[PDB]
Structure formats: C-alpha cells, structure tokens
Structure 1
Amino acid sequence: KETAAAKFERQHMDSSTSAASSSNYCNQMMKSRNLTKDRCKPVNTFVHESLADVQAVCSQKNVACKNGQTNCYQSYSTMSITDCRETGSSKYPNCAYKTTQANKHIIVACEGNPYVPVHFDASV
C-alpha cells in the first residue's frame, strides 16, 4: 500500500503555489487529494514550501509528538501553510471547508530511510 511518506506528500504537500489565493482552495484540494472520498476529513494542513525544505525539518528541532513518540521535529523557520477546516454546516458528500492562510512553524514526525516526514503533528 501507499507508504507513510507518500501519504504525507499527498495529504500535506502543495509546493505549487506560495499561498492560498481563492476561498475554494480547500474545497478543491481536499477533493483532489482523495480526502473527501468516504467521509469529509474535518481538518487538514497543506504546506507551500519545497519538498526539500519540508524534508529538512527532520534535521531541525527535535520535540515530542502528540502521541508521545520522540521522533517529531519543529521547523526552525515559519512556513507558508493553509489550514483547511470543515464548516459547521458541511455534510458529506458535499464537503465544505474554510481556507485559512498562515505562516507558522510546522511539526512533523519523521521515519524511514531516507528520513522524511510521515505525519503532520501540528503548526505553531
């Protein structure tokens, strides 16, 4: 099946643009990345940095993960991100999201060889 590293790129990487322009970004992105298939995925973040810059986080600030593992890393720099969060009114199969652009540090869990993000833990 899809590796954890590949799923991360699918769910969280969008190096295309440097930021969210349109208010339908999330609606569009959540559909295309297969995140509205069976249910509406309620919350998701996309990172608008290069894959190299994101993978480099795995050699930055080591921190605990939410689940208590210690293979999580905080980015030294703030990154361009978009937070997608389902509206109060959203109902499958017409999944509806609010798009919010931010610049924040990301925290990711890293694993494997090469040692790359496999989970998006938080932005801060």
Structure 2
Amino acid sequence: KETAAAKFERQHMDSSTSAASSSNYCNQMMKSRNLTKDRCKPVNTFVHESLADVQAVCSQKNVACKNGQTNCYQSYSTMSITDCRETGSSKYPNCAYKTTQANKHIIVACEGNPYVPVHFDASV
C-alpha cells in the first residue's frame, strides 16, 4: 500500500542527486518511479533537496493552489528541481522526456496529520 505522503515521495523526491544527472535522467526516472505505466504523464517535477526541507514547506507561505483550493504552500527559498516534459514525438507506450534543470520556488499542497506534502502544484 502507499499513503498519500509516500506517493508524493515516489513521484517527486530525488534527494540522491544535487541535480539531474545525465540527459537521460528523466527517461530513466519517469520509468523507474512507475510514472509511465498507463500513459505518459505530460510533465513531472523532481526535487533535489532533503525530505525535511520539503516537508518544512507546509509551514511556509500559504498561497492559492492552481485548482482554487487553499492548502498550497510556497517555499521561501529556491530549491533545486528537474522538470521532465514530453518531447513532440513522445507517444505511449514509448514515452520520451526532455530534462530541464532549474532553481525555483516550489508550491505544494499539504494535507494530513502530520500536515505533509501530497501534491506538487507548481514552481515559480
């Protein structure tokens, strides 16, 4: 089984590297984290920070979520992340991704008790 917090960890956390490794990073990560089983997720972001630093975001700047809900929080500092975005020729089952490294503020939705991240909303 997988709790909501565990799913966020599997889908968005990669503390191992301080930044995306090779240009093949996304293709490999989207595959190993089971993010292309039923379809190709159009976009997925991986965070290269410790879990504690990401969990701490739930006690930072409260802001509105893209879906209108208000349980989203923006990080005060910028974090190291990798955006994985499909290429123009990507088509299930052969999902392919462009790897883009970046340093930006992250916005996640938190829920639960403990109040932890369960959804990655955006980067700014």
**Which bracket does the TM-score occupy, shorter chain normalised?**
over 0.9
Structure-2 separation of matches of 1:65 and 1:38: 26
Structure-2 separation of matches of 1:72 and 1:91: 32
The Cα shift of 1:33 comes to 0.5
Which structure 2 residues correspond to residues 109-124 of structure 1 after superposition, within 5 A? 109-124=109-124
Structure-1 separation of matches of 2:23 and 2:50: 23
Give RMSD over aligned pairs. Answer: 0.8
The Cα shift of 1:6 comes to 1.1
The Cα shift of 1:68 comes to 1.2
The Cα shift of 1:21 comes to 2.3
Secondary structure of the structure 2 residue equivalent to 1:110: strand
Structure-2 separation of matches of 1:57 and 1:38: 31
Gaps of 5+ in 2: none
The count of residues paired between Structure 1 and Structure 2 equals: 124
Structure-2 separation of matches of 1:34 and 1:25: 14
The Cα shift of 1:113 comes to 1.2
Secondary structure of the structure 1 residue equivalent to 2:85: strand
Structure-2 separation of matches of 1:21 and 1:34: 19
Structure-2 separation of matches of 1:12 and 1:25: 13
The Cα shift of 1:91 comes to 1.4
Q: Which residue of 2 aligns with 1:26?
A: 26
The Cα shift of 1:3 comes to 1.8
Q: Percent identity?
A: 100
Q: Which residue of 1 aligns with 2:92?
A: 92
The Cα shift of 1:56 comes to 0.2
In the TM superposition, what whole-angstrom CA distance separates every residue of 1:68-95 from its partner, at most 9, and x where no partner exists?
Answer: 1111000000000000000010112111
TM-score, reference length from structure 1 = 0.97
TM-score, reference length from structure 2 = 0.97
Structure-2 separation of matches of 1:21 and 1:4: 27
The Cα shift of 1:2 comes to 2.2
In the TM superposition, what whole-angstrom CA distance separates every residue of 1:44-88 from its partner, at most 9, and x where no partner exists?
Answer: 000000000000000000001111111100000000000000001
